[PDB]
């Protein structure tokens, strides 16, 4: 920005005006716009090279919003940390960005990328005989890490519970840790002979995600985000079948565990003898050398109260050195104590599967040092238009509250008005009319209701069943 | 709307003034082009013959199908008193105005014109470098001051006064600021030709005692002139009028010779796109436009967040929409702007959407919606939110001795259309403050 006259409307844009730069002669072909301040990337999906940029932008920049025409990504420190791991350097990123960018990359952006892209690949966390060793292929790193207040080819032991602390300290310090598992050369862990039967099929986006995960050839650790119903179960089964090592799956439900196991057996050639389900009903474990243990966070994170059989199961889990952990619905791992299982349970590889990588509190960022960065994400409308998923006509019904109840709404406190505006008659009448119309249309209807009292009242009024926590399996 | 507006203003003028207005061929050549094609055909037929033709002969020319067009043509021609109907010998003979006839004859046959079109100095200047830049800059300054964006060189007191005295650009000294109105947004939505015509028409109405005929002589002669050439300097009123017109960016003066500009020719007749934009389901706007005028007008109903050389990106928010609505802008006008500045990608996707809709159900021809219906619904819902509370000023009538009297007064109010609410059980009703006096007088009588 030198000798550039501001426009009369420049005042409206507070340090956001980007007219101080000029456009390249090949703007008609280059589809990318880069924000020098906020890091937001505007992608033209209707211009040449759009497909070539759609995956690279997903890799290096998180998606903010991806509507039909114009896509919106954003570059952040975590995104760059995820990108720098998979054989990507600032030189290559800048080369591609310049070749695809209508505008030249600013020195500030270059500095920001350089600061964070040159601090990776000097520490590796390994496990040997149920002992966690922080092995570093270089020794000079000691002169700063061992001299730092928190820390403390050379390898030193570290407390299993202190993993959650050391990983966050590594994030704060220049070098973060990477968890790579060379299952090809890993012979100590007994192998499990399970493969995907011919009936299995892998969708194009599933194959793309697996390619982004195994491009180098060594299995990394991280998180996979796919829309609900995209095939996360099949993705996990494929990962387990290709790794061929002892694996434990944690799911936040019992019906989910049942179907997890059912799909597991259906999709792969897993023998029933090698399969074990760890729930409240039956706690038996496979007696084979290698198998899979499917349990729940409640059955893995509890430490005070355990049954006799469940205590033997927990002792088995702790004594054996697991090889892979699959966390379904990982958005709950950063909870007060569920994060403790990551540090306590021993495993060389951690995979998380979740359709949403956001949560109300700020602990979402802790996932970076808890399990690793995000690997792949998939759009919704793209799959909807490609036929992989369904199209929805989402609607919001405005039910006017009647005066009799509204007059009480005004006076009632915060706690009572909640039930008051949820049990208004207009909602009942609209629900009845919609039920009749859609039943004549022959649609299968689900009515969700968090409030148990409202659910019961609606069910008893309409003569239809209700299901909630008290309902037995 | 161009020809309609000019014709309406010319129709409102008195016949005595029109007769003097038709003296100069320059004005006649401009007025002639505005009439409908059938009227122009009849005028050309009548100009070259020095005789009177009955109206029935003219009716014979039009076919049965164009019989409707014949009525509009004759009505429009008679409204301006261009054709003088003389009835004698039992026949409604039709004749042309002698002054208009002579003016057209002189213009077409190169007869004496009294230099109505002006002369040529044969000293040409660079139109692209100077004329185009000057007019573009000055029109941009006036439009920038209209849209309200800050600008250093504020417009002159002449145009500022015209703006204030016109409905355009409502201003209040108590507030100490100027704001755009509904007519202002419509003016900004209109094309360049209509944008110039609106201001010129407002000037025509504003001027008082500078002859009305002289103003039209100058404007139509300016439309006659061609850009990129010199014209030596005319009426005494036209001198100051020329200086004033220089304030609108139509004619350029060195500081003895005046030069018409591109807008001068734009006045006579008409003549990826800049301004086309993409609207996303996330209430985001990406306009592939590089122009401060477009940016400022978008800022009226868009909460701008950043900008690039090639495009402008913003977000629609309740605050910005409420600002635009409070300025008097209608959601219909906003959607009209978005639709007429829709991107080719949006238009193609909407065409595919309409094709899919018709393919699924070709029996019903659904309307073509370029942008998602959710945005339209949200904007109209916000307008409804602004319109939620309804209040009127007036008085309440009660304590009626007799139901007959109560019904009589309420029925009278309803008949005169000043009744807003009534209740027979309570024998009460409310009337507007405007009709309060009439209702009171009727009650007394």
């Amino acid at each position: 920005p030198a000798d550039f006259v501001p426009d009369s409307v420049s005042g409206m844009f507070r340090s956001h005006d980007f007219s101080y730069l000029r456009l390249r002669p090949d703007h008609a072909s280059r589809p990318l716009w880069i924000s020098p301040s906020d890091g937001r990337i505007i992608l033209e999906s209707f211009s040449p090279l759009a497909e070539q940029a759609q995956d690279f932008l997903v890799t290096i920049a998180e998606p903010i919003s991806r509507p039909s025409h114009i896509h919106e990504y954003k570059i952040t420190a975590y995104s760059l940390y995820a990108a720098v791991s998979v054989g990507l350097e600032t030189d290559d990123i800048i080369s591609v960005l310049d070749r695809l960018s209508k505008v030249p990359v600013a020195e500030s952006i270059i500095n920001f990328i350089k600061g964070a892209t040159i601090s990776y690949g000097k520490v590796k966390l390994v496990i040997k005989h149920n002992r966690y060793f922080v092995e570093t292929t270089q020794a000079d790193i000691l002169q700063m890490l061992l001299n730092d207040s928190v820390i403390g080819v050379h390898s030193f032991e570290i407390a299993n519970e202190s993993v959650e602390v050391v990983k966050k300290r590594c994030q704060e310090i220049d070098y973060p840790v990477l968890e790579e598992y060379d299952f090809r050369n890993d012979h100590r862990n007994p192998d499990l002979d399970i493969d995907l039967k011919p009936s299995t099929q892998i969708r194009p986006y599933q194959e793309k995600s697996l390619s982004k995960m195994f491009g180098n050839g060594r299995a990394r650790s991280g998180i996979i985000v796919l829309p609900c119903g995209a095939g996360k179960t099949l993705v996990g089964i494929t990962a387990a079948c290709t790794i061929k090592k002892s694996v434990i799956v944690l799911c936040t439900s019992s019906v989910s565990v049942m179907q997890w196991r059912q799909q597991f057996l259906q999709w792969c050639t897993l023998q029933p003898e090698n399969c074990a389900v760890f729930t409240s009903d039956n706690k038996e474990m496979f007696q084979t050398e290698s198998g899979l243990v499917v349990s729940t966070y409640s059955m893995v994170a509890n430490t005070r109260n355990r049954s006799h059989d469940s205590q033997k199961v927990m002792d088995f889990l702790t004594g054996r050195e697991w090889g892979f952990i699959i966390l379904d619905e990982v958005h709950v791992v950063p909870a007060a104590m569920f994060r403790r299982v990551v540090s306590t349970i021993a495993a060389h590889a951690k995979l998380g599967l979740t359709a949403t990588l956001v949560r109300e509190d700020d602990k979402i960022g802790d996932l970076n040092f808890l399990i690793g960065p995000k690997l792949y994400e998939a759009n919704w409308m793209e799959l909807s238009q490609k036929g992989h998923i369904a199209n929805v006509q989402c609607a919001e019904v405005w039910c006017p509250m009647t005066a009799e109840f509204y007059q009480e709404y005004l006076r009632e406190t915060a706690r009572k008005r909640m039930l008051l505006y949820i049990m208004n008659p207009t909602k009942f009448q609209a629900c009845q009319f919609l039920i009749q119309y859609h039943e004549r249309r022959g649609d299968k209807i689900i009515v969700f209701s968090d409030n148990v009292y409202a659910l019961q009242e609606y069910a008893l009024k309409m003569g239809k069943p209700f299901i909630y926590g008290s309902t037995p399996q | 709307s161009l020809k309609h507006s000019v014709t309406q203003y010319l129709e409102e003028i008195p016949q005595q003034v029109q007769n003097r207005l038709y003296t100069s061929p320059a004005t006649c050549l401009a007025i002639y082009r505005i009439l409908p094609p059938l009227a122009k055909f009849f005028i050309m037929a009548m100009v070259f013959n020095e005789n009177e033709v009955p109206l029935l002969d003219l009716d014979k020319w039009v076919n049965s199908n164009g019989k409707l067009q014949f009525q509009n043509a004759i009505k429009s021609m008679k409204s301006l008193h261009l054709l003088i109907p003389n009835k004698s010998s039992g026949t409604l003979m039709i004749n042309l105005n002698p002054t208009f006839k002579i003016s057209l004859r002189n213009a077409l046959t190169g007869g004496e014109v009294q230099n109505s079109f002006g002369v040529v100095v044969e000293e040409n200047v660079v139109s692209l470098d100077l004329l185009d830049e000057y007019s573009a800059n000055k029109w941009e300054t006036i439009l920038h001051f209209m849209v309200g964006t800050p600008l250093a060189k504020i417009p002159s007191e002449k145009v500022l006064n015209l703006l204030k005295h016109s409905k355009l650009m409502e201003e209040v000294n108590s507030t100490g600021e100027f704001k755009i109105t509904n007519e202002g947004f419509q003016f900004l939505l209109q094309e360049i030709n209509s944008q110039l015509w609106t201001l010129l028409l407002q000037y025509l109405k504003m001027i008082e005692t500078m002859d009305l005929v002289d103003v039209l002589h100058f404007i139509f002669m300016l439309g006659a002139l061609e850009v990129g050439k010199a014209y030596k300097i005319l009426s005494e009123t036209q001198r100051i009028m020329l200086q004033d017109m220089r304030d609108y960016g139509l004619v350029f003066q060195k500081h003895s010779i005046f030069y018409p500009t591109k807008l001068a020719l734009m006045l006579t007749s008409d003549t990826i796109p800049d301004g086309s934009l993409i609207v996303e389901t996330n209430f985001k706007i990406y306009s592939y436009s590089n122009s401060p005028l477009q940016i400022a007008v978008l800022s009226l109903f868009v909460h701008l967040k950043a900008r690039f050389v090639n495009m402008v990106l913003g977000q629609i928010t309740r605050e910005s929409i409420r600002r635009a609505l409070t300025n008097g802008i209608t959601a219909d006008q906003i959607i009209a702007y978005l639709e007429t500045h829709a991107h080719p990608q949006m238009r193609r996707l909407a065409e595919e959407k309409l094709e899919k809709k018709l393919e699924l159900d070709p029996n019903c021809k659904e309307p073509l919606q370029v942008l998602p219906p959710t945005v339209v619904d949200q904007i109209r819902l916000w307008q409804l939110e602004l319109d939620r509370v309804i209040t009127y000023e007036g008085s309440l009538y009660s304590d009626f001795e007799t139901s007959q009297e109560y019904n009589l007064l309420s029925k009278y109010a309803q008949d005169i259309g000043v009744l807003l609410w009534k209740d027979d059980k309570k024998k009460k009703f409310f009337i507007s403050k405007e009709g309060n006096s009439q209702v009171l007088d009727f009650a007394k009588r």
């Binding site: 405005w398 006017p400 207009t426 009448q429 | 339209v376 619904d377």
Partner: peptide, 10 residues
């Protein structure tokens, strides 16, 4: 788009 309709109810 049913915005101008009267609100639903009894």
């Amino acid at each position: 788009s049913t915005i101008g309709k009267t609100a639903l109810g009894r």
